[PDB]
């Protein structure tokens, strides 16, 4: 439906241990295909998906020099932020940055973004129009005044509506078998008695992709409360898992129904616990 | 005996106004046989470099290549000399030399009041305008250098500008203008268009 490419970056300063640690990663709709580690032996953009390994050395050499310069940009940037917020050198700090492109079935850009965060709090973000910024505090408007003064958003927009969507379709075709495929979930309910007068039903969902899924329990018509919704877990093979449990008394074990929604499960599903 | 050796000299070749990605050479010379030269930059990215001293024409110099100019290389540099190395018996510091980086931000507007062609004796004030909210402006006449620094203000039409009163118009000259921000006084914008000020006689 609405596919996307996303590059994530994390720069953490290490005072007593020299240069900052830089981890960056690339995603095409919940699947990772590239990584770069500052603390690697030969730090370079290495493949993390089988369909990207076919790219010539031009892709790797050019994109390795990219995050190489990005790690230096963050080292300079993390250091500057310490003065912006009146902080000393003895503390460790984080600088997260994330850009990418959302593409819809119209075959072109839908949403572009470039967000930044310092120490887990928002800093500055590219607006929806791809020409303005939004600062989170008075210390972030400074860089906004600099980035507007450098026409930074113009270089952003050229990449977002351009190379980002172009290298998105190129990825979605060369890895179509593993990227444009939806795995429906395997679903079943389990029964766990917690007392002589109480028991728990747990709705399961296994081996589904992508991770977007809805899972709620209903009693004769929609209890979102008293439902133990667990976070979508990665299985490890590129699929995901999720479950929600609800506590019921002894008897009335039925009339409690669980509902699942997904993109591989085409018509919506309804199921209950069968002994 | 020798105590602290006197200061060495420090120059920037071709100059202290280094464009982004360019490389400048920071020479450090003196008539004292300094077998070792230490270049130091103060501020947020403090660093020290060590180059050996080459001796020719009884002068000792060292050519510190600064490398592709980035913002983390801007700042004031000082230089030290040493004859021994077991420990460095460092000399007095050289005069500070502020190395700035240019071309990072949009160029500003350099206007002349009462105009570009002024008559002798009249007062002349140059104005450094820009829609970018620069906190301060740097103005220099061709060659005369001595960059003047004034602060700005958010005008009505959305511009931020500074006025540089120059006094009685004598011979004129060509002037350049740069913009920068408070927290980064060594990170300048693209240079403004060179403004030529011409002087003519008072009518009689």
């Amino acid at each position: 439906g609405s596919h996307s490419m996303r590059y994530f970056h994390t720069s953490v300063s290490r005072p007593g241990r020299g240069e900052p640690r830089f981890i960056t990663v690339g995603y095409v709709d919940d699947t990772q295909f590239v990584r770069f580690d500052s603390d690697a032996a030969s730090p370079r953009e290495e493949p993390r998906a089988p369909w990207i390994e076919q790219e010539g050395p031009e892709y790797w050499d050019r994109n390795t020099q990219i995050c190489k310069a990005k790690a230096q940009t963050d080292r300079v940037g993390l250091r500057n932020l310490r003065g912006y917020y009146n902080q000393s050198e003895d503390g460790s700090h984080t600088w997260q940055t994330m850009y990418g492109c959302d593409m819809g079935p119209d075959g072109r850009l839908l949403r572009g973004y470039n967000q930044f965060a310092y120490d887990g709090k928002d800093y500055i973000a590219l607006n929806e129009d791809l020409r303005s910024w939004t600062a989170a505090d008075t210390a972030a408007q400074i860089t906004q005044r600099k980035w507007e003064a450098a026409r930074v958003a113009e270089q952003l927009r050229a990449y977002l509506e351009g190379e980002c969507v172009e290298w998105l379709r190129r990825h979605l075709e060369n890895g179509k078998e593993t990227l444009q495929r939806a795995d429906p979930p395997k679903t079943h309910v389990t029964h766990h008695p917690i007392s002589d007068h109480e028991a728990t039903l747990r709705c399961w969902a296994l081996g589904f992709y992508p991770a977007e899924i809805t899972l709620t329990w209903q009693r004769d018509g929609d209890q979102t409360q008293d439902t133990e919704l667990v976070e979508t877990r990665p299985a490890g093979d590129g699929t995901f898992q999720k479950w929600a449990a609800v506590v019921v008394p002894s008897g009335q074990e039925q009339r409690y129904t669980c509902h699942v929604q997904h993109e591989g499960l085409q018509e919506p599903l309804t199921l209950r616990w069968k002994p | 005996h020798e105590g602290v050796h006197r200061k060495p000299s420090l120059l920037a070749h071709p100059g202290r106004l280094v464009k982004s990605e360019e490389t400048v050479i920071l020479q450090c010379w003196s008539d004292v046989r300094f077998e070792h030269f230490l270049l130091h930059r103060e501020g947020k990215f403090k660093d020290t470099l060590h180059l050996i001293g080459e001796h020719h024409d009884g002068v000792s110099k060292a050519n510190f290549s600064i490398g592709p100019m980035m913002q983390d290389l801007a700042g004031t540099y000082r230089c030290y000399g040493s004859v021994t190395h077991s420990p460095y018996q460092l000399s007095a510091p050289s005069d500070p030399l502020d190395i700035v980086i240019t071309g990072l931000y949009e160029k500003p507007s350099l206007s002349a009041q009462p105009g570009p062609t002024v008559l002798a004796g009249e007062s002349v004030t140059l104005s450094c305008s820009s829609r970018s909210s620069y906190d301060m402006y740097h103005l220099s006449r061709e060659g005369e250098a001595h960059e003047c620094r004034f602060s700005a203000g958010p005008k009505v039409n959305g511009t931020f500008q500074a006025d540089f009163p120059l006094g009685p118009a004598t011979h004129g000259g060509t002037y350049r203008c740069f913009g920068s921000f408070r927290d980064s006084p060594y990170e300048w914008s693209n240079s403004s268009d060179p403004l030529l000020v011409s002087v003519i006689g008072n009518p009689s």
Binding site: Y7, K146, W147, A150, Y159 | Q71
Partner: peptide, 10 residues
Amino acid sequence: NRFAGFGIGL
């Protein structure tokens, strides 16, 4: 391809 990135810092 990744973004070339703006050489300017914050």
